[PDB]
Design an enzyme around this catalytic site. Structure first.
Site, PDB file in Angstrom:
ATOM      1  N   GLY D  80       0.717  -1.215   0.000  1.00  0.00           N
ATOM      2  CA  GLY D  80       0.000   0.000   0.000  1.00  0.00           C
ATOM      3  C   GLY D  80       0.771   1.307   0.000  1.00  0.00           C
ATOM      4  O   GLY D  80       1.976   1.326   0.133  1.00  0.00           O
ATOM      5  N   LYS D 114       6.077  -0.831  -0.306  1.00  0.00           N
ATOM      6  CA  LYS D 114       5.170   0.071   0.364  1.00  0.00           C
ATOM      7  C   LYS D 114       5.596   1.488   0.006  1.00  0.00           C
ATOM      8  O   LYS D 114       6.786   1.719  -0.255  1.00  0.00           O
ATOM      9  CB  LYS D 114       5.287  -0.056   1.894  1.00  0.00           C
ATOM     10  N   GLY D 153      -4.141   1.016  -1.192  1.00  0.00           N
ATOM     11  CA  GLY D 153      -4.261   1.863  -0.042  1.00  0.00           C
ATOM     12  C   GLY D 153      -3.632   1.373   1.234  1.00  0.00           C
ATOM     13  O   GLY D 153      -3.021   0.308   1.267  1.00  0.00           O
ATOM     14  N   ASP D 154      -3.791   2.214   2.267  1.00  0.00           N
ATOM     15  CA  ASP D 154      -3.265   2.027   3.575  1.00  0.00           C
ATOM     16  C   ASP D 154      -3.771   3.217   4.379  1.00  0.00           C
ATOM     17  O   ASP D 154      -4.757   3.833   4.001  1.00  0.00           O
ATOM     18  CB  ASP D 154      -1.684   1.895   3.571  1.00  0.00           C
TER      19      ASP D 154
HETATM   20  N1  LIG Z   1      -0.554   7.654  14.669  1.00  0.00           N
HETATM   21  C1  LIG Z   1      -1.789   7.284  15.013  1.00  0.00           C
HETATM   22  N2  LIG Z   1      -2.203   7.371  16.251  1.00  0.00           N
HETATM   23  C2  LIG Z   1      -3.431   6.951  16.604  1.00  0.00           C
HETATM   24  N3  LIG Z   1      -4.391   6.554  15.677  1.00  0.00           N
HETATM   25  C3  LIG Z   1      -4.020   6.484  14.384  1.00  0.00           C
HETATM   26  C4  LIG Z   1      -2.673   6.854  13.975  1.00  0.00           C
HETATM   27  N4  LIG Z   1      -2.602   6.779  12.629  1.00  0.00           N
HETATM   28  C5  LIG Z   1      -3.770   6.248  12.238  1.00  0.00           C
HETATM   29  N5  LIG Z   1      -4.648   6.155  13.276  1.00  0.00           N
HETATM   30  C6  LIG Z   1      -6.060   5.709  13.214  1.00  0.00           C
HETATM   31  O1  LIG Z   1      -6.099   4.443  12.606  1.00  0.00           O
HETATM   32  C7  LIG Z   1      -7.211   4.420  11.652  1.00  0.00           C
HETATM   33  C8  LIG Z   1      -6.570   4.258  10.270  1.00  0.00           C
HETATM   34  O2  LIG Z   1      -7.634   4.060   9.369  1.00  0.00           O
HETATM   35  P1  LIG Z   1      -7.367   4.082   7.792  1.00  0.00           P
HETATM   36  O3  LIG Z   1      -6.674   5.388   7.436  1.00  0.00           O
HETATM   37  O4  LIG Z   1      -8.673   3.765   7.058  1.00  0.00           O
HETATM   38  O5  LIG Z   1      -6.258   2.944   7.564  1.00  0.00           O
HETATM   39  P2  LIG Z   1      -6.498   1.339   7.478  1.00  0.00           P
HETATM   40  O6  LIG Z   1      -7.732   0.978   8.219  1.00  0.00           O
HETATM   41  O7  LIG Z   1      -6.451   0.935   6.017  1.00  0.00           O
HETATM   42  O8  LIG Z   1      -5.175   0.828   8.130  1.00  0.00           O
HETATM   43  C9  LIG Z   1      -5.043   0.531   9.552  1.00  0.00           C
HETATM   44  C10 LIG Z   1      -3.928  -0.412   9.834  1.00  0.00           C
HETATM   45  O9  LIG Z   1      -4.092  -1.642   9.095  1.00  0.00           O
HETATM   46  C11 LIG Z   1      -2.952  -1.892   8.264  1.00  0.00           C
HETATM   47  O10 LIG Z   1      -3.408  -2.441   7.051  1.00  0.00           O
HETATM   48  C12 LIG Z   1      -2.370  -0.460   8.039  1.00  0.00           C
HETATM   49  O11 LIG Z   1      -1.005  -0.424   7.600  1.00  0.00           O
HETATM   50  C13 LIG Z   1      -2.539   0.085   9.442  1.00  0.00           C
HETATM   51  O12 LIG Z   1      -1.522  -0.425  10.344  1.00  0.00           O
HETATM   52  C14 LIG Z   1      -8.000   5.695  11.858  1.00  0.00           C
HETATM   53  O13 LIG Z   1      -9.034   5.417  12.827  1.00  0.00           O
HETATM   54  C15 LIG Z   1      -6.952   6.640  12.390  1.00  0.00           C
HETATM   55  O14 LIG Z   1      -7.396   7.744  13.168  1.00  0.00           O
HETATM   56  P3  LIG Z   1      -8.278   8.928  12.512  1.00  0.00           P
HETATM   57  O15 LIG Z   1      -9.618   8.327  11.975  1.00  0.00           O
HETATM   58  O16 LIG Z   1      -7.515   9.549  11.418  1.00  0.00           O
HETATM   59  O17 LIG Z   1      -8.377   9.872  13.744  1.00  0.00           O
END
Ligand SMILES: Nc1ncnc2c1ncn2[C@@H]1O[C@H](COP(=O)(O)OP(=O)(O)OC[C@H]2O[C@@H](O)[C@H](O)[C@@H]2O)[C@@H](O)[C@H]1OP(=O)(O)O
Ligand SMILES: Nc1ncnc2c1ncn2[C@@H]1O[C@H](COP(=O)(O)OP(=O)(O)OC[C@H]2O[C@@H](O)[C@H](O)[C@@H]2O)[C@@H](O)[C@H]1OP(=O)(O)O
Ligand SMILES: Nc1ncnc2c1ncn2[C@@H]1O[C@H](COP(=O)(O)OP(=O)(O)OC[C@H]2O[C@@H](O)[C@H](O)[C@@H]2O)[C@@H](O)[C@H]1OP(=O)(O)O
Ligand SMILES: Nc1ncnc2c1ncn2[C@@H]1O[C@H](COP(=O)(O)OP(=O)(O)OC[C@H]2O[C@@H](O)[C@H](O)[C@@H]2O)[C@@H](O)[C@H]1OP(=O)(O)O
Lengths: 460, 460, 460, 460
Positions: D80, D114, D153-154
């Protein structure tokens, strides 16, 4: 921006450039150039890649390869390759960033770049160096080209390495073109390119001496302390000797070799040639210091730089590597009556050194000051003659040594006058004070690039 | 061939070329050239493409983009880009067709092309123009290149636009090359290119005046009516003035600006500069006519061309756009004592105008006749200097203004001589009658292309 | 926009599509789709090119070549090549535009394109067609490719020409790939591709009949008037017959061939095969007049279309060319009791015809109405099976005839259902009134493309 | 190697992998795999580039772009793109390195990569996001392709961004191909791809529960604490609910939202959909916590993670970001009776957390242990279904939801069984102890890659 990694060498180069631009009227006249600075300081492109290669025992080895393609507003990316165990992105970014503005000061259409590897040539056989170059070019090839990016040498990359590199490019791409410079004379090289970088340093300093002394002094009889003993140092030393100066020191990564009588003695061309032959073979100055021709004439100092050891000296040409003149060494040179210091090496002076030289300049009128010239101005003859090598390759013809040397001379003269004149316009010194060559060269290089970038829609 | 669309401008240009070939002994000597004419009149390639771009309000906009690659026997396609709301394929075919033979007259290896868009720069911000240029080049890039097709400016495309286009080409193709001409001085431009097209028109007319008057007259003391106020008009006017002529008119798309005293007064370089500045900002002459620097010296004639309003005049240089001298206007110039008219603008004269000038030439011996020269001859200096900008970029060096200007003069003199001698050879006039520069230029350009095409197997 | 050239076929197709979108709730629900309509109606790319080729006497010949790459949001450009003396940009734009929406109704990832030439295969030898195709592909090849643009046949382009085209592409590009469809069985063709276009028209009409009668009637016992006698007409006729229908007419560019007893008689497969053999040889149906087996059974009407000459008929399948059913012919079909009309040919019905059928639909409840289906729905089986040819070539495998035909049938059913349903949703008819298959098809195809364009940033 | 920069996230991932390989018999059986580890851990290629883009006020903005192309022995690079202000090379290297082995565990031919940018979507308009994506792809385009590198995505990159990215790739490269996954359903997307990553986490955990409890327990009635509220968390939560589990918590970057009754209450699909709609609009959970539907049912905790706040819980699915389960949080989960913890987020557990889970496993037989599964195993369904999207695009066909979900299920089952079985072979636990899923998955992913690399001559 606490996500950005700490890159000390790059930040040092950036901060010095930026500071000289702030300490001028440039951003009063063109405040929008602050946007140009923010844009230009992020490289257009960087390629990093693994290089797997085989040693003479048949063992797999792994090194890291890089090409920083910093800016191309003025031309294809242009700048050397460094093979040295210190190499990393920070170091190549400093070099690549410097290269942008160095290249701008030549007047030729060359953008800024730099690359290389943490491969260490020392302790390797020619065969290992060949295999490494083959592997390195196998990946680099797809990112470069005569109208895209034209590398050349630097620390650890001589005509030998450029040969292996070129041969592999040719084999991969099935094209014979000016994709590299520093090539051999029968296969698209330029006369004067071997000599160019160190000759240019010296040519530049001639103008500094002429200007500061109103033509009263020259290199004739001046005592010149040089550091390094590679391509830049060697030919700087030879040009100094040809102009009737005396070279009192050279050095390498293990020590300094200094004449015992610094008031009256000098390296000779024969001695320089002997040192150069050791260096082709990746050996140290230490090997010859007890031979008959050296034991009595010179003192070898393991672990020391030359600056505090040469007694009274007139000119200093650091020609080895970055940050090789400390603040204390600078104060020593000043106390020894040194009046001219030009960087053969990129970022050769530490910040503390530059500050010492520039405070001295501001405190002492005319010929009483130590006058400091930055590597983007003084080292620019190398890249300039590379540009001429590109021009020859494009024309499909080869120029005479006299023709290339004449152009080199004109380019270095113009580069000094541009730095001088730009400092007078934008950072006008007090009455009787020499203009800052570092400020003027920085402003002159930067504004050329920033304006070409604006014209091309890189910023607005 | 009732499937073919009606393309008035192209058919006009084609028919006048063909008519002049027919009215000569060309097809008696080389009847096979009729096959060549049939082939050359169908473009090698045309690319049309949608250009979506964003206005300053964030709104989607759509315009039509074009590149007509008409003929490449004598070199890579070469010719400008027009951004004007009239633009369509018919217009660009007329222009690209003309460009084949114009380029043939320069002596340089340049094929014929032309392109552009119906995007109207008037009423747009610089930012809007930048976004448009970025989007336009995103598609055009894959069709062009330093050895394939090298565009440049024309109506609505200046160095500003060339910059945005160049910058986007470099970002897309990762190459710094001579893909456009009209570039900026620090990034591959040529000295004299800004002046070249207008200067060339005037250089060409110097030879006309010299010949018709057997050296007794020059531009010194002649009254010259110019139309337009853009790049070609501005520098044609400036060269007329340098030569001691008086410029009595300029015009733009909303009106003519004529000196009140056309017997004695002239525009000055400072007044030309003020109009030029307005045109950089895409404003109209009308804005000036209030300024007391203008209100007392000139009359503003909205909706009118200059030709009937200048009184007695000696030279006319239409330098705006196609079909800007009507038959009536040609008769008026003839009645006003006009003895020289050259097209600064492509296809500047209507067919009725040309027919009047050529009938007058055939009825009036020597200096008594009005002598008409076609744009493919008179306007050739601009593209010629672009071929020189290409030459400079390929050499990786920049020439002096004097060097470029000297070459420009030689090219315009040869163009004039070729037209004259070719008319004497193939369409020999009655005793004392000036040879037809339009017939001669047409034949000379056409045969060179036709023969090269035959050599290259494009027809047989 | 009076700079834009008049393109009558294109404007007709655009206006009909736009009118059906306006005559619905689409722009109440999604008014922003008016922006998508404005963007989609300007082709992404159009290539036009000269085609010089040699005739059997050794003479240079010149024709014009074209490829309209209208939209690629849904897939690589896809659509046929037409070689016919009428060909011009207007016509190929109408075709390419229609192709966008036709392709969208197949469910496969295929963007819309069309191309061809004004080359007339009539009166040419097979060797001349070979030479032409060689020359045509020499330029077209750089613009097309298996993931870029995949052409196929159309009027004047059969499997013979696809062969010469494919061989030349292979020779030029040194690749064997699905760059064309309609290829021969041993070199990447698909079973059922020859049959597909005409089969799909009939399959589509079967669903219209089923819906209009709740399954109680079919093609069995129906009288079907067909026009044209090429690929689409031949296989439509053959499928009608297979289904127990009677084909009462076929026609070509010189006249119609009609069974004498249209209440009871039909073309047979053997008769259709004899016609197909004439057409392979580029001959006319008129030859069959001299043959008593034909003259006894049929009437040949030079200069006439079939519609007013077939007496009472049940289904009409115009399958020749655009605008081959006039308003008066439509009225005659209505008066003769025709209840189903589907375009085998692109834009087969004039706008007056469409308006007559749609007014009838709106005025007549249930099975009393004539029901009109547009080409983008009914002709979609050909392009569909080409998409399957692409799928087979990407798989590197060949599917059975039953597998392809089964998929074709599912595609045509889904196509019909989508038009029917989308009309019910956006243009809901009065109780008892058949939904508009033209409006429904148009909305369905347009919304799919417009939404994908939005997702992809083509408009916002 | 003190020249190498400090990259904490990359070093963390590397060290955990390496430690699991050392704590096994792998290097007794295959000591030469140590060479494989040294090679594989240096990326094949990294591209970094400047991204200049325009905000809605017309201002120049600068961000940094990256693509880490880590390993391609098993397939084109796959993984992603992350748009988040923390992004740097260290973070993308951790992710890219993880991706190698994750991809290996799917069974599909996908290498590891990535990329992304420090662009922050929060606070930007859709238009700004569009312009950024256009600029980003303008450079990325040349480095990727359906058989070279296929992003998706990611964090910060949803189907919206993939649309802008794809449209720009198409525009640049004039090709329609599987260059990205996570595409829209009408333009080459796969059913089940939106659901895949979170569904897979849950599918994987089903196998963990089955195994640990010998089939006695399932998700039915289990209490599941989830963190994050984006794509992974949303669909993990929905699958848990579909299987009759109860989701007691979600969270975002500002806080946690926890049911007040964690023994018996759960998020519902409707509530999840409301949160998802906020997240499309880049808003925070905090916005809805006082609406009627939420105020009484849930507690919002600003600044807190859910783990210590959910009371007694059965399953934990960290689904937000790296290092979001501390050692103390791990001990809390253990004390709360949590028996299953699987990383939806890459490297979601800190090292202290992993060590706590794995010490617990080693100290507690069977179902009494907390069983920890790493993200390279549990998160692999996302990339797997991307591989299926590539397969569909290659076939030029679209599969059913049931077909894709069935393959997803089989892939996750195989991935669990491979980790289980490999841990039993190489790191055989004591009697009654659950095998290490982290060790087994690491060894299984690594040996597949190392052996393919050896076969291909990457090391020897
Ligand atoms: N540094 C951080 N500290 C705390 N929370 C974090 C941080 N960065 C991200 N998030 C949260 O994780 C969620 C990410 O959602 P998406 O952007 O839709 O990403 P996805 O669900 O595809 O990926 C989540 C995990 O699943 C793996 O596939 C990816 O690399 C990652 O480790 C949101 O609720 C996002 O928060 P928000 O909706 O942007 O407030
Ligand atoms: N980290 C270091 N510490 C102290 N000395 C250093 C260090 N790295 C290099 N050198 C010396 O500088 C000389 C380098 O010679 P070449 O490899 O031939 O490089 P070149 O002369 O082309 O370049 C010297 C300077 O001139 C600039 O053009 C370039 O970027 C650099 O700053 C040798 O005497 C080299 O020492 P040695 O010959 O390898 O022992
Ligand atoms: N349709 C038209 N009717 C009347 N006047 C026209 C029309 N189109 C343009 N012009 C004027 O001609 C002048 C054009 O200036 P530039 O845009 O700078 O073009 P350039 O001077 O390079 O070309 C003039 C002619 O010279 C040839 O090289 C070129 O194809 C064209 O036939 C402006 O004063 C321009 O007027 P304005 O400055 O845009 O108002
Ligand atoms: N302008 C015209 N006026 C009247 N008839 C026309 C005209 N142009 C063509 N045709 C006829 O249509 C039939 C064309 O057959 P093919 O060349 O095999 O084309 P195909 O059957 O693939 O296409 C028929 C229609 O189905 C659509 O796929 C396509 O775009 C077109 O609208 C022939 O009987 C052909 O007549 P002939 O066989 O060339 O005399």
């Amino acid at each position: 921006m606490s996500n950005l990694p700490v890159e000390p060498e790059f930040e040092q180069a950036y901060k010095e450039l930026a500071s000289t631009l702030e300490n001028s009227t440039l951003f009063q006249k063109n405040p929008e150039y602050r946007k140009a600075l923010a844009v230009v300081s992020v490289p257009e492109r960087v390629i990093q890649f693994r290089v797997v290669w085989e040693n003479d025992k048949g063992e797999v080895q792994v090194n890291r390869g890089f090409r920083v393609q910093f800016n191309s507003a003025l031309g294809p990316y242009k700048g050397g390759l460094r093979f040295h165990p210190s190499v990393n992105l920070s170091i190549l970014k400093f070099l690549g960033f410097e290269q942008i503005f160095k290249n701008a000061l030549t007047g030729l259409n060359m953008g800024g770049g730099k690359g290389g590897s943490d491969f260490d040539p020392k302790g390797k056989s020619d065969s290992e160096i060949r295999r490494f170059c083959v592997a390195f070019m196998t990946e680099l090839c797809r990112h470069i080209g005569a109208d895209t990016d034209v590398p050349a040498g630097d620390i650890g990359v001589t005509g030998r390495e450029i040969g292996y590199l070129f041969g592999q490019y040719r084999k991969l791409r099935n094209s014979w073109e000016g994709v590299l410079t520093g090539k051999g004379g029968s296969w698209g090289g330029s006369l004067i390119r071997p000599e160019a970088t160190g000759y240019g340093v010296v040519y530049y300093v001639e103008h500094m001496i002429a200007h500061a002394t109103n033509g009263a002094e020259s290199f004739a009889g001046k005592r010149v302390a040089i550091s390094g003993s590679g391509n830049v140092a060697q030919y700087a030393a030879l040009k100094v000797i040809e102009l009737g100066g005396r070279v009192v020191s050279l050095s390498d990564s293990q020590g300094s070799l200094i004449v015992k009588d610094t008031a009256k003695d000098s390296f000779t061309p024969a001695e320089i040639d002997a040192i150069a032959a050791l260096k082709v073979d990746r050996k140290q100055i230490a090997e010859l210091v007890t031979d008959a021709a050296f034991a009595d004439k010179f003192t070898y100092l393991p672990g020391q730089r030359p600056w505090v050891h040469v007694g009274a000296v007139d000119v200093a040409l650091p020609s080895a590597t970055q940050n090789e003149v400390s603040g204390e060494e600078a104060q020593a040179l000043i106390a020894a009556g040194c009046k001219f210091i030009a960087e053969g090496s990129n970022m050769g002076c530490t910040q503390a050194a530059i500050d010492a030289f520039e405070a001295h300049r501001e405190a002492n009128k005319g010929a009483a000051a130590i006058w400091y010239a930055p590597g983007k101005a003084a080292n620019a003859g190398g890249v300039a003659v590379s540009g001429l090598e590109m021009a020859q390759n494009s024309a499909r013809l080869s120029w005479t040594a006299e023709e290339v040397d004449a152009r080199l001379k004109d380019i270095m003269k113009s580069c000094f006058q541009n730095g001088l004149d730009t400092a007078k316009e934008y950072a006008t010194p007090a009455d009787g004070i020499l203009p800052s060559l570092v400020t003027g060269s920085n402003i002159a290089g930067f504004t050329k690039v920033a304006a070409a970038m604006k014209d091309q829609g890189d910023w607005w």
